[PDB]
Symmetry: D2
Subunit: 266 residues, 4 copies
């Protein structure tokens, strides 16, 4: 029985990925920051379906130190991975899904806002994933060959549309670019350990409708395939496949799940 | 019971892709050019496993005219797709797998230059274009209520063409053209819900490998075909116009 | 005095590139297909400004045979490059600019064969043969008598990754041209022949979408980049593309 | 006389870029962190060649607060740009060249890692971001009637990051982020006519702190010339992208790698 660690697993795409992996037989460590209620509800559902098949761990993945000597992001990430080993004695899959997403305009309080966004946006999207991957790899390396799993797989949730930047989201876009870099670098360095590292990049998935219906419909209408945003499963299914043994030759690449959105022009 | 058309399905990756799809329940149209024996042997196996689940069609996919007025590549491609409709009344998946691959050095005749161009460009790019056109036309001509629910076109590309193989310019160009076809076809065919994606192996079933970061070996046919099968599945119904490299990290290397 | 061969040099970008190179001191071979008048007018201007600094040569770059044994595209391409050597004894720069551009819809008949040969010929196959002919001549030239700055520019397209609805063949041909750039650069490196691409977005339209200036570009705004890539200051650049699209390729629908 | 701000301008490519721009008529603000001597020697040369055509500014571009309330990286970046306006009343070109480069292996303390992250990410990505922000803020605050006619930002990226260098994850990531900054900044800053492009060297003025045969093997891998590039072979491209003849280019990268990124193992 393999174990998967999914960050930001409480709702939306994170939950779908956790459910997807759980359906495949994985025990799942559900990470969360502020959504304790949803995360615990998910753990309860999964555990009821299969005893001892889900746990939850809380952690701010922003690049800042927390209250205990202050606790660093790295430590917090190492503990995330450790929680898996302590509870199930293993960690086969890591999905870097947690991510902050808000505007950081270059054009037009301001001090803490700019410094907090950087740590938050870059922490969740890039730096935490880096430390998490490091911790994940250190545990595999420290495991005697004969006792290692046969299918280690790390999935980085990237973004199919960052090459056509979203106006006013520079830091987020930068962090995603860094995450793409982490995928390529990690794949290469971790190859000898047979740890595959790939990226999955959604375009528009379960789009939040905090706007006039016509503006919500207009956005969806842009996606060439189906003229709609995707469902959570339409993304998570791809994540699950990349984690399957049938994908054991794939590493260091990205799979876009955008219904052709990245093919469009203004 | 859906139908898949697989060009160059006689051996290696093509055969694995055909077997893969067949295992999923697809009736398979096995195209071939010169490998009649192997194609028929594959058909026999597949048919024995499941009656009327496989057929074979021969066709030179090079960009030239053949003997019947002369028959053009387009016609030959249209007849390929037609064979599916004539036999099973449908064609849900098209896998552009057939491909010539040999050197066309820029640095050191006339006949072998024009034959290579038509051959390398035909199989890798032009035939796939015509095949996609024929495929789309048949779907468009089908009344909505009678259409399939999962049309998928897979273009077998190359994960290493951005790091060209010395001396293989035409092939490399043809592959680039196939990449363009993937993006263009995906966009144009979206309204008809026909997804178009690419699968790019790096080193698969080499008849060099120590340079592959993952496993330090070329891949097996299944390691590639499984990806093709997944992209054809309904679980991949939101993926279109993209490429999936199956290279074990080879495209990440430098000299 | 170096020589530059510019295909489709009669008007628009081709003409601007030819003028740009000529301004840098290049003798220019202006290729054309149907635009004889404009090409000859340009030659006259350039020749008046500097005697024996321009010539014009006609050639269909479509992948078809033409009547003088039928003449193939390769031969026609080889003669294009040869014309330069015959007249000036050299060919330092080749700019693959000539290009057909029209719809080949997949949804709603030899016109498919004429389009294929035309769109693929001008955009990809002719460039391939031209590069081949160009490289041969350099290789056949004794080291001591070779130029010091061989440069091949392939006019590509900054927007083909975001295909233009209904232009599949053209888009494919451009993808092949991109492939030719990378392959040619690698193979021709030992001969010090640099091969790069320049990809305009919207230039000299026959708009409000272009993030930069909200307008298509002028011909000079593209050709200047072609000229720089041909200069000695760019001697370490090869196998890459420079987009000249004012940020258009950064947009979404 | 237009002004160019060049980070890490003391030596190597930074110096070449500064010299290049200076040769084009630009007054140059030479930024440096540790190389005061080299930077001041360069300022002297440029100033002798043309009075009041160069100044130096020191600043740690790592993502850490410094001693004067502690001073943040943003403030330090804002002061860098300000120094240009205070001295010459303008800032037309910004070249994000400063960059840390060392291994951060994934496979086998507290200070070295936290310090590496802030350093590698600060110089390569975050400082560039703040610098661009500050640069854009001052242009926006300038009345259209007093604005320059050729604002240009160049981000020094890396032509080989897509084929990562074993053991350099953070650096590679930071470069990826810099690439994202280029695309995002180009789009957002288009209305102000501020072009943003990248220049990515492959192997330039390769350090020879190794056995000659090893150093030669490394260069031999580059398809064109079989050698690393000179500083000018890179800087000349930066200067071209900053010229008015490149006014339609924005949001793109120009590889200066002699075909290195075309190779396989
Ligand atoms: N949905 C879409 O259209 C697209 C999504 N993506 C990518 O897919 C992934 C998932 O998408 P989606 O479901 O929309 O993501 P969400 O926006 O819904 O956020 C996912 C989770 O990330 C967690 N998170 C955010 N910041 C932090 C942080 N500072 N520390 C720890 N956890 C944090 C949150 O957990 P909690 O609630 O517990 O606080 C949140 O639930 C993301 O990485 C995203 O970048 C890419 C393109 C498009
Ligand atoms: N194998 C690898 O390491 C790599 C493969 N690829 C791509 O994957 C795909 C399959 O690879 P692989 O199995 O090795 O392919 P093969 O080289 O084994 O050839 C596949 C088939 O293509 C057919 N074919 C060749 N030329 C023509 C033509 N003129 N007209 C009609 N059919 C033709 C042949 O059919 P027949 O024998 O019946 O005549 C052949 O069996 C190809 O598209 C290839 O480009 C990409 C990268 C690497
Ligand atoms: N303009 C733009 O917005 C864009 C242009 N580009 C590329 O830049 C390059 C130049 O652009 P532009 O000036 O608009 O090009 P044009 O469309 O104006 O065509 C250039 C020339 O190509 C020649 N040509 C066309 N077909 C053939 C053929 N079958 N055989 C020989 N010559 C042929 C024509 O020569 P003649 O008139 O003598 O017959 C024509 O003058 C092209 O490669 C184009 O693809 C890319 C993106 C955008
Ligand atoms: N040279 C090459 O082969 C390649 C270079 N590049 C890129 O090109 C650019 C220039 O290359 P190169 O000349 O080799 O760069 P260098 O490695 O020589 O360093 C450039 C300068 O960056 C400054 N710097 C480093 N860290 C900081 C920091 N923490 N805060 C402030 N300044 C800092 C240093 O200034 P000081 O000495 O004053 O402390 C140094 O002089 C870099 O961005 C590099 O990433 C990309 C690929 C290859
Ligand atoms: C907002 C949002 C979420 N999204 C998707 C999106 C992307 C990344 C994410 N990342 C994370 N962590 N969480 C998310 O919820 C998330 C959501 C959108 C992105 C782009 C467009 C879009 O293309 N709109 C037009 C805007 C037109 C205009 O303003 O001129 C465009 O073409 O840019 C719409 C929605
Ligand atoms: C030959 C062959 C089969 N192959 C695989 C290959 C690729 C595409 C195909 N395409 C098709 N249609 N059929 C094939 O059988 C096929 C096989 C190889 C490809 C690359 C290297 C390689 O990387 N060589 C060296 C140097 C490459 C270079 O010249 O730059 C290296 O990098 O290690 C070796 C073998
Ligand atoms: C037509 C034409 C010429 N052109 C420019 C163009 C491009 C390549 C060429 N290539 C050649 N050889 N000759 C040309 O004259 C030429 C001209 C255009 C290209 C794109 C759009 C455009 O982006 N239109 C839509 C998007 C279309 C889509 O989404 O598919 C938009 O909304 O902006 C408009 C005009
Ligand atoms: C180191 C370094 C600096 N560099 C160049 C480089 C890149 C970015 C920089 N960035 C910054 N800021 N400063 C620099 O001095 C700098 C230097 C190199 C990069 C790649 C290889 C290389 O091709 N390595 C081969 C090794 C081959 C082998 O030994 O088997 C490889 O496969 O990766 C060598 C040197």
């Amino acid at each position: 029985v393999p174990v998967a660690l999914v960050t930001g697993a409480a709702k939306r795409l994170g939950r779908s990925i956790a459910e997807g992996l759980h359906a495949e037989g994985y025990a799942v460590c559900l990470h969360y920051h502020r959504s304790a209620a949803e995360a615990n509800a998910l753990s309860a559902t999964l555990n009821a379906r299969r005893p001892n098949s889900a746990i939850t761990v809380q952690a701010d993945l922003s690049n800042v130190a927390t209250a205990p000597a202050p606790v660093t992001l790295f430590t917090r990430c190492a503990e995330l991975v450790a929680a898996c080993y302590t509870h199930w004695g293993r960690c086969d899959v890591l999905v870097n899904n947690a991510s902050s997403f808000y505007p950081t305009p270059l054009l037009r309080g301001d001090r803490e806002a700019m410094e907090t966004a950087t740590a938050d946006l870059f922490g969740s999207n890039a730096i935490a994933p880096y430390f998490l991957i490091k911790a994940f790899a250190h545990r595999v390396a420290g495991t005697p060959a004969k006792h290692r799993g046969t299918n280690y797989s790390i999935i980085n949730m990237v973004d199919a549309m960052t090459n056509q930047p979203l106006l006013g989201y520079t830091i987020y876009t930068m962090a995603k670019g860094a995450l793409e870099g982490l995928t390529r670098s990690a794949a290469l360095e971790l190859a000898p350990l047979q740890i595959r590292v790939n990226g999955v990049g959604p375009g528009l998935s379960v789009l939040v409708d905090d706007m006039p219906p016509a503006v919500w419909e207009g956005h969806r209408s842009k996606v060439p395939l189906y003229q709609r945003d995707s469902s959570a499963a339409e993304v998570s299914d791809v994540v699950i496949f990349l984690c399957s043994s049938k994908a054991k030759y794939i590493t260091g690449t990205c799979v876009k799940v955008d219904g052709g959105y990245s093919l469009t022009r203004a």
